[PDB]
Each structure stands twice: as C-alpha cells, then as structure tokens.
Write a protein that binds this ligand. Structure first.
Ligand SMILES: OC[C@H]1O[C@@](CO)(O[C@H]2O[C@H](CO)[C@@H](O)[C@H](O)[C@H]2O)[C@@H](O)[C@@H]1O
Ligand SMILES: OC[C@H]1O[C@@](CO)(O[C@H]2O[C@H](CO)[C@@H](O)[C@H](O)[C@H]2O)[C@@H](O)[C@@H]1O
Ligand code: NI
Ligand code: NI
Lengths: 329, 329
C-alpha cells in the first residue's frame, strides 16, 4: 500500500488462550495510533476483570478520524462468541468466531481501512475440529489476499532473519532451494525491506546451504551450482547481496551489525540465533502480503490464560514493529 | 587419565601466523600451572620484540617440579625452524617443524608428561605442500593416539555444544545419523563431561534433526525412527538425556541454562548460537582423545601476524578451560 492511515487492527485470537490477556495488557499504555481490536467485547472486559486491570472499549467508527489509543482503553470492532468462554479450555463452539475475526481484520488490511494487522495466537486444532480448513494465519491471509508467495521473517528490535525454506524435513531442504525459489524469496525480501521497513538500499546477507558455504565445493555443490548464480542474477537487477557466507561466520555480531536482513536457507540455520537473542520478544512478520502483518511468535499458552503470568513482550514488540512499518513506509 | 600434573603443553602452531603472537601475549600474566611451549625459541623472542612485549624462556626440565608460570615468561621445549620466519608469509620449509611440535606435544599428552594440550592455529595447505598428510589437529592427534572416535565440541565459559555430525554437506546429514552413531557420540560426550569437566551427573539436552523435532512425524521421521530409540537405550545405561527438542526452543537461555551440554545434530544447527554469544572467545574441545585437548577456534590470521591486532580471547579461554579440566577432573 502506498499510503497508511493511523489505525491498526489487532486480532487477540483464540478466546480461551492468552491473546485476550495480552491485548488487555497492551491496552494499559498510550499508543500513537488507534488500536481497533476485532474480538468479543464481553470477553475482553471479563478477561480484564480476571486480571484486575481496567478497560473501557470505544466503539469503532470507520468514518471518524483515528484517535490515538489512550491507556485503559481499546477501540472495539465487536464480533460475538457463540458460546461462553472459559480460560484455558478450548471450545469448538468458538472457532467460527476466531476465523470471523481474522476474515474481518484481513479484509480491512487489504483495503487499507486498517494500516497493519497484528495477530495474537490461535489454535489450529480447535478450528479444524469445527470443520474449518486452517493451518495458520499465514495461509489464511495469503489465500484470502490472493497472494501467491509469502516469505517468513522472524525479527527482533535488532536483527531480522528471513527463511528461504520453512517447515520441511531436513532431507527436503536441499532440493527445495532452486534459482527460481531464491529469485522469488529475495525479490520479496528486498521489496519489503524498502516498502515496509523503509530501508532505501537494503544490505541483505545470505547464508550458504552447506557448512562453510560449501568450502569451494569440498563440502557440497549447492553454493556453486545454484546459490551463487541466483545471487549474481539478482545483483544484476540491483539487489545488494553479500554472500553466501558460512552461517557460523555471519551470525557473529561483528558481521550481523552490517546486515539489514539475513537470509538463512532453512529453519534451524536461522531461527536459533534469533530466539537466543530475542529474550522472548521475537516477532513473526509475514512478507509478500499486500499489507503489513506482524505476530506473536508463541502459541495460545492455554495453561497460562487468565493467570497474569503470560508474557506480553512478543505482542508489545509485534505492535511496536507494525507501527514503525506504518511510518518508515 | 585418572591423574593430572601441573604442566600444560601449548603448540603455537604455524610460525608465520598469529599463534606465536598469542602465546607471547598469554605469557604477560601469571598462571597456576607451568606453560611448556613447544616451539622455536628464536621465533618467540623475535615475535615478542616485533610486538614490544618482554619475554624470558625457561628451559623445560621434565624431571623437575612444575613451576607456576610467571608473567613475562614461558617454559620452552625447543624445536628449531628449518628456515627463517617472516610473519604473514607461509613457507613450506617450516612445515616439518610445525608437525614435529605437534608429535612432541601429543606424545607428552598421551603419557601424562603433559596434563593438557592447547593448540594455536596451523595451516593445512602449507603442511600438505611439504608432502605431509594433514587435515587438522584432530585427525593428527586421533591417529597418533590410536583413538577410533572423537567428538567435536565448541564451548564458551557459559555454553557447550557438541555435534553429532560435522563437515558434511547438508544432503548427507540425515543418512549420517544412526542409532549406532548417536550411541557412540553420546557415550563419549557423557564420559568426558564426567571425567574431563568433572560433572558427576551431566544433563545432556538433545536437538531433533528436523525443524520442531519432526512435529510428531509431520515434518520428518528421524526423531521417531532413530533418535528417540537411541536416546531411550542410552537412558537405560544411565545417561541423563532430555529431548529431542526443537533447536529453536532449546537454544533459548531459559532452557539453555539447564543444560550441561547440548548435542546438535549438525554443524549449522549448533555453531551459530555459540559464535553469536561467544564474543570471539569460543574454544574447540576435542572429546574422545585419551587426554585433554583444547584449541583456538580461529585460523592462522596471516595478515595480522606481528601487528599486535590479533585477538588473544580465544587462546586465553582455551587455556582457561584446559586448566579447569585438569582440576575439575
Ligand atoms: O569458505 C567459504 C566458501 O564460501 C564461499 C561461497 O560459497 O565464499 C564466501 O567466503 C569467501 C571468503 O572465504 C568470500 O570471498 C565470498 O565472497 C563468500 O561468498 C566460497 O567461495 C568459499 O569457498
Ligand atoms: O513438537 C515437538 C515434537 O518433538 C518431540 C520429539 O520428537 O517431543 C519433544 O517435545 C515435547 C513437547 O512438545 C516433549 O514432551 C518431548 O519430551 C520432547 O522430546 C515430539 O514427540 C513432538 O511431536
Ligand atoms: Ni517453526
Ligand atoms: Ni566448521
């Protein structure tokens, strides 16, 4: 989107989970944008009561100017649960409700009614148990957006890793890396660093696939046959790319500090460092969608729902990042 | 070895490299053990001159009591270079000398003449160019020790990762993990944590091979078919093992803090986090050898030889770890 307004939509997600707690907790401070929470209002107020935190919900008025959200409030875009919610207890009765809040939030983000979509956790199993096709937010938003390719990034305030491949068995990773696949992934990554993170000339640092980036062909051939040629084609199109580098070189701070994003070839090459340094404030950012979407990188934490022990760090950081992307855009 | 004396052998390694600088720099403080440096004495004194640091070499007297090394000195076990050494310039003429210092140091560590072997960097190419079979210190010491299996560990003062597999292309990793291979690797790892690190009941935490440790068979089958059964056999023999866990769970500090060592299944699953947090003070420790051996985790840094800019952190930490292993043993 070339223009962004001053309203963000938040879906708390699974009502039995901690998303509601976390939304209510986020709401105890002032924000520079309007926080439009798509959720059941009774739930939020009752969860706020269970946690002993105050909360006033303001009706969402689409035709009004955004009002920067004030401490002790949220702006509600009300959607009703079908059944009573009991914290910690999944109930198939409320899955239509969860997915409805996603649909609404996604439709808004698409049109630009909402400047960014920030998501709390949902539970795939209970959604499926209600007969609704669902894997994650990513596929639901991609399909509803008619978005043909997305790229996963995990990011903290200080470090961004994107993945060339995601939830594949290790056996399948080398075959899944092609020149075509890397072309698509890096184009999206470079495009969003510019358009979403507002970095005019992103420096993207790339991991080899093999240990020591293949050590001259002595420890694998994928760097020579596939990665290097793909990067060179992209550099011809103007994308600033350094690598491929050994992962255990690149992930030293002395080099990391130079990267705007790192592209890991596979899940466990990239995520461990981020989680190590993340202090539980890591944020999932879905690239390639036609709008800004950030997310918590934890689950529903059902056992912690309504306890006051759920950590708000991921959600606060997700919302913080969203807001910078709205602006640095 | 059931008993350790108060003498450590240091091989500075490649004379044209930074190993000599680093040895001379280590020597500017007091140590609780005797530091027997197997190297050319003219080289060390000349490198000390180039770096403007003082240095007195004490002749090594095997039949005397160890004397705790004093600041401004080393104990020399002299071995002559064949040709003049020029910092930064590899010379095939001196490779026989490098390998001779390794042989001597290794023979001593074997017999218990030396309580631990700590190695500076060597350069494989120049050793090979002189017609001498060489890959690394590890294979040279393993073969000379008649040691049938070694396990690589990278460790800092705060975190230890061992690897189930090392310098293999990613394609080869899943096939290289067997019940047999994991049995051998974990036996060695557990044995050395007890005998070398002095941890009576090591808690070893194990990564799955696949992302999310295979997610119940939905993201790979190796955890179910191979890893889990291997760990259960080992737990029957009394080895305390937690996992397999997702790498991007396990490498969070909140869980790491509980592990005495982490076993990563492959190189890039384990090393990046260690290097990230290592601040360049990471130490390679070779497990399974019949003596304690620690090492720098950097190369010869030829361009930095005699500049005073080479970082001593890895070497200081390597020597520090060696000394604790001598004692905690
Ligand atoms: O040993 C590293 C190995 O990685 C490659 C890429 O596959 O090169 C990387 O490392 C080089 C420094 O060792 C850099 O000059 C290069 O730009 C970087 O891509 C291989 O060529 C090399 O053998
Ligand atoms: O999703 C994790 C995945 O890993 C396995 C091992 O392959 O189990 C690990 O994680 C469980 C918690 O989710 C622990 O109970 C277990 O001890 C640990 O090994 C799989 O069983 C699971 O599907
Ligand atoms: Ni994942
Ligand atoms: Ni390596």
């Amino acid at each position: 989107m070339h223009n962004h307004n001053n309203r963000l939509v938040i879906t708390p997600g699974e009502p039995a989970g901690v998303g509601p707690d976390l939304a209510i907790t986020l709401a105890q401070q002032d924000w520079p944008v309007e926080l439009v929470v798509c959720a059941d209002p009774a739930l939020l107020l009752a969860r706020a009561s269970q946690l002993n935190l105050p909360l006033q919900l303001r009706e969402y008025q689409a035709d009004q100017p955004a009002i920067a959200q004030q401490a002790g409030s949220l702006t509600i875009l009300p959607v009703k649960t079908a059944v009573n919610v009991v914290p910690g207890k999944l109930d198939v009765g409320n899955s239509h409700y969860v997915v409805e809040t996603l649909a609404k939030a996604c439709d808004g983000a698409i049109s630009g009614e909402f400047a960014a979509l920030v998501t709390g956790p949902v539970q795939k199993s209970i959604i499926n148990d209600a007969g609704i096709p669902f894997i994650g937010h990513t596929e639901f938003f991609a399909d509803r957006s008619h978005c043909q390719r997305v790229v996963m990034m995990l990011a903290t305030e200080e470090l961004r890793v994107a993945l060339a491949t995601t939830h594949l068995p290790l056996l399948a990773v080398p075959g899944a890396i092609t020149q075509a696949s890397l072309h698509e992934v890096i184009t999206i990554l470079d495009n969003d660093l510019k358009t979403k993170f507002g970095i005019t000339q992103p420096q993207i640092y790339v991991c080899g696939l093999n240990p020591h980036a293949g050590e001259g062909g002595h420890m694998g051939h994928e760097e020579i046959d596939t990665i290097i040629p793909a990067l060179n084609t992209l550099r011809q199109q103007g994308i600033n790319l350094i690598g491929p580098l050994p992962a255990d070189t690149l992930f030293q701070p002395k080099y990391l500090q130079h990267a705007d994003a790192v592209l890991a070839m596979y899940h466990d090459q990239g995520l461990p460092v981020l989680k190590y340094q993340g202090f539980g404030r890591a944020v999932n950012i879905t690239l390639g969608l036609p709008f800004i979407r950030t997310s918590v990188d934890h689950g529903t934490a059902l056992e912690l729902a309504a306890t006051g022990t759920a950590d708000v760090g991921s959600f606060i950081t997700a919302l913080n990042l969203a807001i910078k992307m709205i602006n640095n855009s």
